[PDB]
Design a protein around this ligand. Sequence first.
Ligand SMILES: *[C@@H](C(=O)O)[C@H](O)C(=O)N[C@@H](CC(C)C)C(=O)NCCCCNC(N)=[NH2+]
Ligand SMILES: *[C@@H](C(=O)O)[C@H](O)C(=O)N[C@@H](CC(C)C)C(=O)NCCCCNC(N)=[NH2+]
Lengths: 173, 173
Amino acid sequence: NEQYVNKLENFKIRETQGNNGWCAGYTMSALLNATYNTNKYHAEAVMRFLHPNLQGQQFQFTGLTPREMIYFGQTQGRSPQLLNRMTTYNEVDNLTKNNKGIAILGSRVESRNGMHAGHAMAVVGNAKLNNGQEVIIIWNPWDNGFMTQDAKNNVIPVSNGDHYQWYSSIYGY
Amino acid sequence: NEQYVNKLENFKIRETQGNNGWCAGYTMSALLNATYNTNKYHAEAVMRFLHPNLQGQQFQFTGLTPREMIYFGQTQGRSPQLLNRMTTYNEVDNLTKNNKGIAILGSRVESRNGMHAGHAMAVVGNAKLNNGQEVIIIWNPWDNGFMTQDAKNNVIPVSNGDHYQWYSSIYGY
Ligand SMILES: *[C@@H](C(=O)O)[C@H](O)C(=O)N[C@@H](CC(C)C)C(=O)NCCCCNC(N)=[NH2+]
Ligand SMILES: *[C@@H](C(=O)O)[C@H](O)C(=O)N[C@@H](CC(C)C)C(=O)NCCCCNC(N)=[NH2+]
């Protein structure tokens, strides 16, 4: 389907998200594994590093803040930067060519007692389709495969039928 | 090279062993991921489950006993059995067809102040080559690939030049 494809070279899915609140741990482990060309990071280990005192269900379901995500990247030799919007196709193209990972911070369009769950995903790269559309390739931690998102649209449809608005990005993993 | 190949269906290498003493954690995570068709087990998490109080270098380098390996499999819904020898080609063929994993317990032929380090590896399956040789396919946690071992020989040459005698096996993961 693609005429041009630009991906993070060594990105590989090695684990998927089950019943826990560790989406940002999944996302940062896969981006650091790709930019360092390693297999040592795993979500559980990220989470235990940042939340050493939580146990049981609290450990299982407590997610991360953007500050915790930025400090984690600094501890692993990166300098992540918060961008308070969705990255453009050109931005993704240039960061991907430079081997810099991008985490997506998404907010669920569908509500539940007025609250919009937050969910983090990873950018894998970008591509131009045969009809000219400019797309960003995304890995959502629940899936064993990637999605393609038109770059003009800031709401990503995910595999269970929900929709997440890409409201901010952390780049530099 | 093979005329017949019998492997554990969903075995996949998802991580390799760096500077730690967690070979048995690597081996059991890959065998349980394959027999359960999952990606949730990782060596670090096995080790932390069995050694919750060790920290720092003690945590990093303390390996497992066979009893700890057997109790770990019981906690994950398996009934591993210790066999005080190398499994035969036929045994590997039948266990593999039945989706039962086998851990190799190896002892280093080369010594260091009279001590023979212990190192655990995983069986992936078995195969018959085009010249008729009967072989067992092995994954050593340090490698990103498999080895083939003639079934008549109980000493496996590994990738750094050392040799490990297969002295016992734990099957049933
Ligand atoms: C994501 C998930 O597992 O699906 C998980 O809930 C998560 O990390 N959510 C985040 C937001 C993403 C990073 C966009 C969020 O909800 N953050 C607030 C969680 C803060 C938990 N508290 C502390 N104190 N660390
Ligand atoms: C293997 C390695 O990382 O290369 C690692 O050293 C290991 O687990 N070795 C084992 C033997 C294999 C299971 C054959 C071994 O050396 N066992 C004795 C280690 C016991 C450590 N102590 C306790 N108390 N749990």
